[PDB]
Design a protein around this ligand. Sequence first.
Ligand SMILES: [Cu+2]
Ligand SMILES: [Cu+2]
Ligand SMILES: [Cu+2]
Lengths: 115, 118
Amino acid sequence: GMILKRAYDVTPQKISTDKVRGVRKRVLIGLKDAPNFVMRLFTVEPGGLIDRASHPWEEEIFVLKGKLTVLKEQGEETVEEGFYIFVEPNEIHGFRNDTDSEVEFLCLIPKEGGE
Amino acid sequence: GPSGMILKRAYDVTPQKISTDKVRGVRKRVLIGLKDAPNFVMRLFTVEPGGLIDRASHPWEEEIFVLKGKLTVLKEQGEETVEEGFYIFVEPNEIHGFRNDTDSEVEFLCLIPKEGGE
Ligand SMILES: [Cu+2]
Ligand SMILES: [Cu+2]
Ligand SMILES: [Cu+2]
C-alpha cells in the first residue's frame, strides 16, 4: 500500500513520433496503481521537442532540472527548475529544450489521459 | 472551465505554517489549488529540521515527489529514509507519516485528489 522508489531507476521510454523527438518518458505512478491521476517524469534531450497539441484533460507540471521552453498557442515562454505549470483543459501547449543539457519535468494528468 | 496556462516560480507562492495535533515544524505552498484544479491539487511541503507529520491515514491516495533533502517516511511497520529524486505512492487508507531528522529543510511535492482538500 506504499511504493517508495528512485525515479531514475524506472526505465525510460524513448518517444519518437511526428510530433515528439528527443524525449524520454518514465511512468512513475501509472494506471496499475493510480485511482485518479498518473505521475510521469519527462526528460527532454538538447534540441528535443514536444510539438504543440491539446487534449481534453488538464496537465500539472513541475520543472525539476534545466531551462524548459514552453510553447503556447501564441509564442513561447522559458521557465526553469522550480517552476510549476498548470495547463488548462484544451489549451495548446508543447515544449522544447534549446539548451545544451537535459531538461526534466514532472507531469501529472487525470487517468482518462492514459499513462 | 477557464482557458490558459499558469507558469510560476513555486517559491513565489506564499507558504502557510501547518500546526495540528499531528503536524509540527511544517510549512506548505498551495501551487495548484482548489480554486483552479478540476481534479487534483499540487502542494509543496517544507519540513523544518526536527519537523514531524505523524502517522495517519485518510480515504484518498497521495502522490509524492521528493525535491530536496533526506525525508524519513513512517510506515505502518517501521520507517525508511529516501532522498531527492524519489517518488512515493500512498494508497487510500494506508498509514504513513514523515519526519526530518536532518539539520536542513526537506521539500517534497504532494498531490491528492481535490476531494481531500488542499
Ligand atoms: Cu497497507
Ligand atoms: Cu499535454
Ligand atoms: Cu497523508
